[PDB]
Amino acid sequence: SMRTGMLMEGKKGVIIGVANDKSLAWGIAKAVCAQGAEVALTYLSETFKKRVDPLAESLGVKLTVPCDVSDAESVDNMFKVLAEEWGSLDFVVHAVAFSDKNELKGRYVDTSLGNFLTSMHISCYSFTYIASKAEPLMTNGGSILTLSYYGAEKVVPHYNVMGVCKAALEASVKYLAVDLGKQQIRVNAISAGPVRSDFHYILTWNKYNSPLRRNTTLDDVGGAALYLLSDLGRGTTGETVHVDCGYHVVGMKSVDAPDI
Amino acid sequence: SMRTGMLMEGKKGVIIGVANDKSLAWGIAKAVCAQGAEVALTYLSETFKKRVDPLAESLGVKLTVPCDVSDAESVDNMFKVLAEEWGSLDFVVHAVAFSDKNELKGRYVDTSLGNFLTSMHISCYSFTYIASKAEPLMTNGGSILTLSYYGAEKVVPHYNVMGVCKAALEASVKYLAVDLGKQQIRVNAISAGPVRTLASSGISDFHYILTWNKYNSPLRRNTTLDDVGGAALYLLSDLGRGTTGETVHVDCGYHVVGMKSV
């Protein structure tokens, strides 16, 4: 639980998507809390609250609030609570995605309408709606951040409809940046490499072929989130920053990496 | 009505989205028909058959079929009709998009859920569904084409959720190209510059968009239906056999402009 710097001192923000200590949302929470941020964590509903409690305790988080990002009334209530507790907000982190697991295993061309719309609602639209509700609380400027992946830009096998959803999200970041920039609110994404069967293969491929010859870590993603959410990042908006050990630059499997 | 070449001789295909003679879909139809294609034109419902009849007659099109891309049964019936008439298909052109006109006037951040979902369904998902229906009719290869716009890539006015929908569409093109390429089916998009379709739309932002593109594009003119037709001829004919997953800009160069023409 050790705080190690003061880069986020005096900044208050909500992180949406921390359900365990292995996730990207957790890596970001740990990084900003270690730099003095005052954080609220969300949990899906009362039934799943006891899972967030100890994560909040280790971070030093004192405010946890219910939020189901597919439910407009739940999101509205969450911001009402933050408004009452804090009056203003400095940052929002949106680390939530959803898509049908079985359709990911199939071909993209076989995607069903229901899965397409559900995935788009949770993975893409929720960010826009959340941004709309955060705006009146972010009077003194601030920073809103979401997460993406290289499958938004190039075809990654079995990422299917999530690639399409993340492409939509990356575009939404740009349109949001224009709307919210009038209030000095930045809007950005981190395009993260995979962090350590299908998943094992993608992770190994990234290890073998990335320029740094390692996988992305939670600490890497936390560092980038600190840039974007602190005063260091005041001049960057509408951007998708790759935090993937350089994988995005590679146009072909390394000649001396093994095929797998 | 006069055929001028043979680039599409022996190719059969369906064009979805021709409702008048001013649209991109019409420009494409005119171009492929003039090169010898056998074309089927869709119309939205029985109400609109009167509007498409004279367009089809002037193109020499003998097959028209209902197709409302929000209704899976309608789409399924359309491909049933093509399979019965032709047995196989060489090309598909998808020129359909929809969003709530009132939300376009406002801010992207105020987009409603209903508008987002409906725009996504019609403007992006329908292309994927149509591609899935075409696949078994194109075992011998061919070409599937959709339309996009620079608002998919960069923020432009009076576009809002359509920018997000088009970005999703351009990503879907890439995924579809991987799925359908083993069968030698190419999947591509044309990112077209704005064209005047109405004498006056009554929307100042549209006048602005058109004017800005005209004066600041490298060619110092607006995109025409002929321009888009020619690009479609590349992508849909044998000339385009080696290109797939691509979004080709047919916008008089506007996409390269970082500031303004001097």
Tokens representing A40 are: 């609220």
Contact residues on chain A for B182, CB-CB shorter than 8 A: none
A66 beta partners: A43
Chain B positions in Cβ-Cβ contact with residue A191 (cut-off 8 Å): none
> 3-state SS of chain A: helix, strand, coil percent to 5?
50, 15, 35
Experiment used for this model: X-ray
A255 a known binding residue? no
Residues of A with a catalytic annotation lie at: 149, 159
Q: What residues contact A91, with CB distance under 8 A and at least 6 apart?
A: A11, A12, A13, A14, A32, A37, A142, A143, A144, A145, A229
Q: Which residue of B has its CA nearest to A167?
A: B168
Asked if residue B81 lies in contact with residue B3, where contact means CB atoms within 8 angstroms, the answer is no
Q: Which residues of A touch B120 (CB under 8 A)?
A: 116-117, 120, 168
Measure A190 CA to nearest chain B CA, in Å. Answer: 18
CA distance A187 to A258: 39
B-interface mutation test, from A148, A162, A164, most B Cβ less than 10 A away: A164
Q: After which residues is chain A broken (C to N over 2.5 A)?
A: 196
What is the Cα gyration radius of chain A? Answer: 18
CB A70 within 8 A of CB A126: yes
For residue A174, the one-letter residue type is K
Q: What is the dihedral of CA A231, A237, A243, A249, to 10 degrees?
A: -140
**CA-to-CA separations, A199 to A195, A204, A205, A206, in angstroms, rounded:** 10, 9, 10, 11
What does R_g of chain B's alpha carbons equal in angstroms? Answer: 18
- Tell me if residue B149 is catalytic: yes
Question: Torsions phi, psi of B178, nearest 5?
Answer: -65, -45
The reported resolution of this PDB entry, expressed in Å, is 1.8
Q: What gap in Å lies between CA B57 and CA B1, rounded to an integer?
A: 9
Cross-chain CB nearest to A168 (options B72, B168, B179): B168
Q: Residue A107 burial by CB count (10 A; 0-12/13-18/19+): exposed, middle or buried?
A: middle
- Choosing among B144, B164, B173, which should be mutated to test the A contact, i.e. which has the most A CBs within 10 A? B164
Indicate yes or no: CB of A132 within 8 angstroms of CB of B116: no
Nearest Cβ partner for A172 among B113, B124, B164: B164
What residue has token string 């969450």? A78
Give the rounded distance of the alpha carbon of B258 from its chain centre. Answer: 26
3-class SS of residue A38: strand
| A120:B168 CB<8 A | yes
DSSP state of B44: S
Structure tokens at B91: 């090309």
* Domain residue ranges of chain A, discontinuous segments joined by +: 1-260
Nearest-by-Cβ selection for B120 from A120, A132, A177: A120
**Residue from A127, A172, A240 to probe the interface with B (highest B Cβ count within 10 Å):** A172
| Size of the A and B interface in Cβ pairs below 8 Å | 108
Distance from CA of B176 to the nearest CA of A (A): 6
B117·A128 Cβ contact <8 A: no
Q: How far apart are CA B134 and CA B123, in angstroms?
A: 18
In whole angstroms, give the CA distance from residue B132 to residue A111. 9
**Chain A closest CA to B188's CA: distance in Å?**
14
DSSP assigned state of B237: S
Superfamily of domain B1-262: NAD(P)-binding Rossmann-like Domain (3.40.50.720)
Residues 6+ apart with CB under 8 A from A165: A97, A99, A119, A120, A123, A124, B168
Please, are residues A49 and A104 in contact by the beta-carbon 8 Å criterion?
A: no
Alpha-carbon span A210 to B190, nearest angstrom: 33
Q: Which residues of A touch B123 (CB under 8 A)?
A: none
- Domain A1-260, CATH 3.10.20.340 — does that match? no
The H or E element spanning position A58 is helix A49-59
> Chain B partners of A172 at a C-beta cutoff of 8 Å?
108, 164
Query: Do residue A176 and residue B108 have CB atoms under 8 angstroms apart?
Result: yes
The residue type at B42: T
AA identity, residue A168: A
- What is d(CA A123, CA A70) in angstroms, rounded to the nearest whole number? 9
